[PDB]
Amino acid sequence: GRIGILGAGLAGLAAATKLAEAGENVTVFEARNRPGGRVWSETLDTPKGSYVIERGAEFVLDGYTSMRRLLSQFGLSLVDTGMPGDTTGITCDDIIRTLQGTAEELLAKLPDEPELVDALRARIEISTAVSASEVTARSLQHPSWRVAGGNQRLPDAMAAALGSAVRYGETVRAVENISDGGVLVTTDTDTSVFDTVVVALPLAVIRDSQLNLPTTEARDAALKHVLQGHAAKLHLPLETQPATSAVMSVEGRYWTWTATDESGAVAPVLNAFMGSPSAITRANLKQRPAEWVAKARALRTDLAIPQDAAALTTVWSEDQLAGGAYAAHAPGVTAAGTALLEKPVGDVFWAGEYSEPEFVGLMEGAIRSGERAAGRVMQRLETKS
Ligand SMILES: Cc1cc2nc3c(=O)[nH]c(=O)nc-3n(C[C@H](O)[C@H](O)[C@H](O)COP(=O)(O)OP(=O)(O)OC[C@H]3O[C@@H](n4cnc5c(N)ncnc54)[C@H](O)[C@@H]3O)c2cc1C
């Protein structure tokens, strides 16, 4: 009755936790030496002391009811974050007024006022993390918390409860269905055998040519409409507690914010998120990272950034175990194609943020997807027996 789960992100850990509770025997393969995947919490030293920062996923939003259930069971608390003018809203209203096609095709229909149109384009590109020329126009249609002590405390606790079932330092390279039943999971070192497997790997990993996973023409047809969002997290220390804030940069395609932690004080950390691959390339975070600090300092003259400060950068696009930040939708995504993506191929099931139909791309979606896959696996094992 052996189940193999590939990836110890929220999707894989949620699948494994539900299967463990059902009394099944699970093994979780994780390439990193930590759980959580794109949930990754660390501390940043500042002149006021050390503060938790989110190098990946940050905000728990309204409606994250599966994650809230898990936080309750693992004893973890949510902390309120405490967080040109309006012309972008009106311009987006005119935009809608004019859901087929791409956002850019709709922006092209607006009166040709380029700085204002580009301000709206930037808002779209930051949040969808893709070019406006590729994302569905339906994205134009579109209070917060963080986990006390770091969002990664949740996957940390889920993994800890699975104990020796979680196998770190294991890089999956192939997954093969066997005709008479069962699955072979091959890492860089050796192969294991399972009755069923849940692939809970990133979108970019399951589409990577360096891995041999089960595929079908129907899946390939649905996957081609799922875009890879790209984003980088950036953090700077501050010399004193600021007000809470949220301030966007049009030219840089990034957002900055300052937020309260469990103490009730606003942490002296400038948090930042840059979205869309062309923005990250224009920023040149790897080569000349003082440039972005200079831009951030100019954007946020109200914040006291030390003069010799260097940004902490987390460019998930360059991590072969992530390959981007989250999924986005091209115009051609359908509910039926999205549903297809979680159906098994042989005895190989699937979970991840990219196949969630409502909370697409979010921590809540990864959890919900993992828990759906666990339910499908339990039906398959009931069948095999
Ligand atoms: C910068 C950034 C900001 C975000 N902001 C938010 C936010 O504010 N709120 C929100 O809800 N969501 C946000 N997210 C999205 C959220 O991080 C994801 O939806 C979610 O964490 C994805 O979980 P997953 O389990 O699907 O994938 P992952 O977390 O990527 O887990 C997949 C796992 O597979 C492992 N792995 C990869 N390749 C292999 C291999 N070959 N063999 C074995 N293991 C392998 C990885 O190491 C990883 O542990 C953000 C993401 C990023 C990157």
Describe the structure.
With 385 residues, this protein is of the alpha+beta class. The protein folds into 3 domains: 2-34 and 152-227 and 330-384, FAD/NAD(P)-binding domain, CATH 3.50.50.60; 40-61 and 231-322; 84-142. The chain has helices at residues 10-21, 65-73, 87-97, 103-107, 114-128, 153-162, 203-206, 217-223, 277-283, 290-299, 335-340, 363-384; strands at 2-6, 25-30, 41-46, 49-54, 78-80, 145-147, 166-168, 172-177, 183-187, 191-194, 196-199, 226-229, 231-237, 245-249, 254-258, 269-275, 312-315, 326-329, 348-350. The chain has a 5-stranded parallel beta sheet. A 5-stranded antiparallel beta sheet has the order 14-15-16-13-17. Strands 8-9-10 form a 3-stranded antiparallel beta sheet, with no helix packed on it. A hairpin with a 5-residue loop joins β8 and β9. α1 crosses α6, α1 (10-21) packs across α12 (363-384) and α3 (87-97) packs across α5. The termini are close together. 44% of the residues are buried. It binds flavin-adenine dinucleotide. Flavin-adenine dinucleotide binds next to α1, β2, β13 and α12. Belongs to the flavin monoamine oxidase family. It comes from Paenarthrobacter nicotinovorans. InterPro entries: Amino_oxidase, FAD/NAD-bd_sf, Flavin_monoamine_oxidase. It catalyses: 4-(methylamino)butanoate + O2 + H2O = succinate semialdehyde + methylamine + H2O2.
